[PDB]
RNA sequence: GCCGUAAUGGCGAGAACCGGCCGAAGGCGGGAAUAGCCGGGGGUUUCCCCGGUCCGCCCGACUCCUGGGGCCCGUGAAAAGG
């Protein structure tokens, strides 16, 4: 699968939350399906995230690129460090759960 | 894309925009006009009386405060006290 393709898929397509402190507001307050997470995202945010996914139950998979690399691959200009998918339009992002 | 600077610029690692919180030198009132000063008088040995002590602008530090930027094979004390 390529991660980046389908990501601008669930984007355009679907609902898709882009930036720290609105995935943690939906993991908080919402019902996200899956977080998806720099690898280089610093230590404070990880264990935020990995504390309220958990708490959630939403799995987080781990992007294997830097938040400058995520927002390329899903078409922004500016970094990305964490990013929550609620509705996988016509993509398979879902995939990257397993 | 959007928001900028004297200059460097800023933003999903959260911008614009809106509302708020902390926060200088110093300003202003009180002190305080009763003082001091200026002018006009009367005493005596420094005392008393009378009038004014205003309006509107400008420049402005080497003094005081604040913030930005840069440099170092150089990094610019310590303790009492609080
Ligand atoms: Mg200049």
């Known amino acids: 699968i390529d991660i980046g393709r ?8 679907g609902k898709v939350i882009i930036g720290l402190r609105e ?8 019902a996200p ?3 998806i997470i720099a690898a280089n995202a610093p230590r404070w945010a ?5 504390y309220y ?9 781990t992007f294997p690129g830097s938040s400058i690399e ?5 078409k922004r200009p500016h970094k990305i460090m964490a990013l929550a998918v609620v509705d996988p339009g016509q ?3 879902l ?3 397993e």
């Open 33 to 35: 399906k899956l977080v």
């Open 23 to 30: 995935t943690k507001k939906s993991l908080l307050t919402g």
């Open 95 to 97: 995939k990257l759960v």
């Open 70 to 74: 995520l927002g390329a691959a899903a």
């Open 6 to 13: 389908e990501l601008q898929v669930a984007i355009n397509t």
């Open 53 to 61: 996914a958990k708490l959630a139950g939403v799995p987080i998979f």
């Open 91 to 93: 993509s398979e992002i």
């Open 46 to 50: 990880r264990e935020d995230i990995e």
